[PDB]
Amino acid sequence: MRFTFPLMAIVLEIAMIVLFGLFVEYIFFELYPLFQDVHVMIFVGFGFLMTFLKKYGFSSVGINLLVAALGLQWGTIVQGILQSQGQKFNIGIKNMINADFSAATVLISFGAVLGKTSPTQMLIMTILEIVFFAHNEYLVSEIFKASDIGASMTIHAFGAYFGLAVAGILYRSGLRKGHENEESAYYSDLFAMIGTLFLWMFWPSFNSAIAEPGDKQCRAIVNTYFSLAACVLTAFAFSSLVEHRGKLNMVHIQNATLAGGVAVGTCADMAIHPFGSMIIGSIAGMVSVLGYKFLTPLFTTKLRIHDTCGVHNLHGLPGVVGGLAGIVAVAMGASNTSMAMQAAALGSSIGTAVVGGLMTGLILKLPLWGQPSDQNCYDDSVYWKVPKTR
Amino acid sequence: MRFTFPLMAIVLEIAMIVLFGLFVEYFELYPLFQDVHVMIFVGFGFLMTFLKKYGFSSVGINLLVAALGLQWGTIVQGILQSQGQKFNIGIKNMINADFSAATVLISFGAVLGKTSPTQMLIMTILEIVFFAHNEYLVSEIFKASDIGASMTIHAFGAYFGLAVAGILYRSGLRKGHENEESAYYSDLFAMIGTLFLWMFWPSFNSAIAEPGDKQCRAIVNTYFSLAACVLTAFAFSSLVEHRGKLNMVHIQNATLAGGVAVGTCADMAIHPFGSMIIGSIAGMVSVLGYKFLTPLFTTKLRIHDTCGVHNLHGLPGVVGGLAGIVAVAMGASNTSMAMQAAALGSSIGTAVVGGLMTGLILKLPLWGQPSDQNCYDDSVYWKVPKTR
Amino acid sequence: SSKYPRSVRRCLPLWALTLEAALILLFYFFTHYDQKGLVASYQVGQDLTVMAALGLGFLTSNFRRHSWSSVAFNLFMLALGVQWAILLDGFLSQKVVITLFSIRLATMSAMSVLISAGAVLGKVNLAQLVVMVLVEVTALGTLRMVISNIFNTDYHMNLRHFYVFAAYFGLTVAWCLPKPQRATIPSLSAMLGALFLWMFWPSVNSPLLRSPIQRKNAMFNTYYALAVSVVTAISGSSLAHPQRKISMTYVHSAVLAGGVAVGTSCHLIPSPWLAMVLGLVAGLISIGGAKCLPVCISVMHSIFSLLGLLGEITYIVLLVLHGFQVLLSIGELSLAIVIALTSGLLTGLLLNLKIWKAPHVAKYFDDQVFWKFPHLAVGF
């Protein structure tokens, strides 16, 4: 009622400690730089990407930190228990990387409901979404045996669709026309560019960390690098195209510049060529800007799904472009493994995300977690001590 | 026309895709690459965010210019190395593409606030050609050592940008502009780029250094040059201001001059004390340039340098080339002194000629250049928020 | 007394340039240069550099009108401290060979001073900070030399006590200064610094570990303890607040609680659950300190001193499992605390000197004392 959030967090930490004590024991320095880049993407990249809101920077970065810090522990436990089939396991650098990937999926879902949820709801969403995400990625990697090294399907599409499903269940009628606080400021947009640029720079490590050392890891780095480079050009061009008087919009420049990194993930270690990554990146940037311009108003006003950060345009549509690219790549001989297995990976990702998101959102709707009122959405002052001076 | 910029960006990206499909084929140096990458996108981009009403354009056009530049630099540098044949992409190709982006960002600092993104696209395309040809001339014809690229990146980029800015001279801006001012939080943001550049410069100067003694020397020499440069930049910033006040321009930029001035000599055995001497001189020269030489360039030579890149990249780059000549004279390296001097002269001359031609192309009233009243304002090209 | 600052146009440049000339001379007379894993060894020192400049530099930038001085003065102090620590650690451990490892050690020495300085920033000028840097580097080197002479330890391995030394030195210097706030954008910048400190703190828990296995275990332990401490800090910040809200300033410091708690024993901890227990204890102790220490000047520095003491205490408790060892370790800890307090008192006494032209107490925490701004009347 007043002590709900500290109580739930301490209970969760005690549970994490018990699970580590029962199940967790102790290439590493080859992959540690890549893990560090992934870590910076998790905590600075997504953390400051969402600080564009003028009255929500504290909650954006701080709840990002809280969600991701709980998520790395819980994802370690869940992914390791899945890999070990219920027995004790030793953790190495790959366990940490995969746990940060799980936290990334939860943060993508967080970007959909940003400014409309409490930290308690975010703890609950972290715990449930890591379970759904980890079971889906186990199904994709071990049952389907598909190729998703950058996880366009198991991270980006899954997280974006799980978030939209929570956002639709948690939909508020008062917010459909808009909100006075759902607005950026100048220095808020500069902080959001901090997050954008760190994500953009370290994405090759994100897509290549789990790739096989040698040709596949190098291909993943090169493909991500050039896909992002092409994505920037198309995102700027179409942001000028769609907006009034041809003026750039910082929402597009902050988000659609990462669509090429999202859309190359499934094909990253595949031999698609530098030109192929650049074509995907160029399309992903165009699709992301067009989504922000046209799909987000349609989704908000007509479908009653409100996406605060437009994660559907950064992670959802570019994630489906990535899965679609991988099926086409298998068709063209870029990679082995079945075309149908890649298609099944895409379908399982999207479907399990929408099922799990709806059930998690049903748990979140309960009026027991201190969610803000319609008037107090996108406002740090509900949960934070806010300085008088900006 | 409002469709000039999106058409140019799309056509340039399609040309990049075709060139990559025609000329390009497919882990110890990857962390150094990532340090250089951070210097390109966070360092320079936020370093230029000091202008109070131009932060969006500084950081965003930095991203756009560098993203175009790495692709075009990949093509141009790979073609020059391969003599027209297909080439493979390794970590060194990516590092060199980031370097080519750095040169254009340095030139962008000179014309910041007075140009449109379309102009920046054109400048990136032409400048990378001029830069890569000078770089090939220095590395292959002269065979002079410039491992930190004091001459080929910093002096080249600075004098190219000064040539462009001199071509694009606006008479109404000579006595100052209302928008050409910093803000308190804007300088706080600019310190982010300052700190990232300062922290990662030893990787910038050592990434392509020969592994072993040369790479270790480049790391250590760059580090101690920067350490000396910070102290001298602070001291001279206090010295040249009333009552010893620190100037944020000096602290944001002149603290980096040690990295620029040690670049030619970074892998030479100049010792930590020698690198410290070079960094101290660089800090002094940079602060003095910002205090006295920039007003002379703006008001008398009609060369308006927005970011004072002549004081961070130009003069310390020349100091670095001269230090390379002296170090060869002292026998620290085994190159030719005449070749180091030739490299410095060719860098400056090619930079000025190419900047002249590029600015003449940019001077055409086709690219949506702002008016004098609208210089240093994001609102010409961006949707600006109502609040700060 | 005039509240308007005295001109430093001759004091500060002369002081800094004389220091740099002396450093260049000493390096010339006493320093000397000198494979498969050069980049791997460089990465650890680069992480420490990032934590020193970005982390501690921005962490204290939270002040409404003192963010410029926090960031830039931290950079100046790092540049002075590393150069002086190279020479001092060469002298007290013997010419000085300059390797990547000695640069990494000197960065740790400078980070000691940067942590201590957060207790006094906003109340001192740059010359006072120069004096603080010089005296604190010399004092930490003396402490390490004395520990190596008495307890037969290694001078470079005595750099483990740097948490507790920095905490107590900073508090003792703050206590000697004359007696004397947030904004949103500086708070977000301080969050950036806090995040970089939090992310790279596993590196500072294992730059002194030679063996690969101890490094890997130390990094794991620091990682898991830090994650637990972050969750505990953000959750329990609401408990220790009259307004029942989360305090961003409290989070900025309490994120690092688990890393401080395990830092001295992260190689000894064999299983991640024990590191997570230590991180939970560190977070709860941070909450209790934030709720009690103000009642009985810097609250964050005081709770850091408590956390450093707890880290030493848990190192003592763990060291027995893996009676004379207890007494030697307690004597070493008491020696570190006594030397830190004594050199802090001496530093604060030297800082009160009128020759430094310190800011007036009515002018604390304002960049206007040190920096040029437009449209101001200057001088008389």
Ligand SMILES: CC(C)CCC[C@@H](C)[C@H]1CC[C@H]2[C@@H]3CC=C4C[C@@H](O)CC[C@]4(C)[C@H]3CC[C@]12C
């Ligand atoms: C790069 C620097 C150091 C040396 C080279 C400077 C050259 C490239 C530039 C800088 C000064 C420039 C001149 C400065 C001012 C004017 C007056 C204007 O009505 C026409 C252009 C003209 C005449 C410029 C032509 C180009 C110019 C000569």
Ligand SMILES: CC(C)CCC[C@@H](C)[C@H]1CC[C@H]2[C@@H]3CC=C4C[C@@H](O)CC[C@]4(C)[C@H]3CC[C@]12C
């Ligand atoms: C503008 C330019 C000319 C100024 C910079 C040049 C001078 C001041 C610098 C750069 C080149 C330097 C020298 C280069 C190499 C060595 C060899 C080394 O074993 C002793 C130091 C010594 C001799 C350096 C001392 C300082 C030095 C002479």
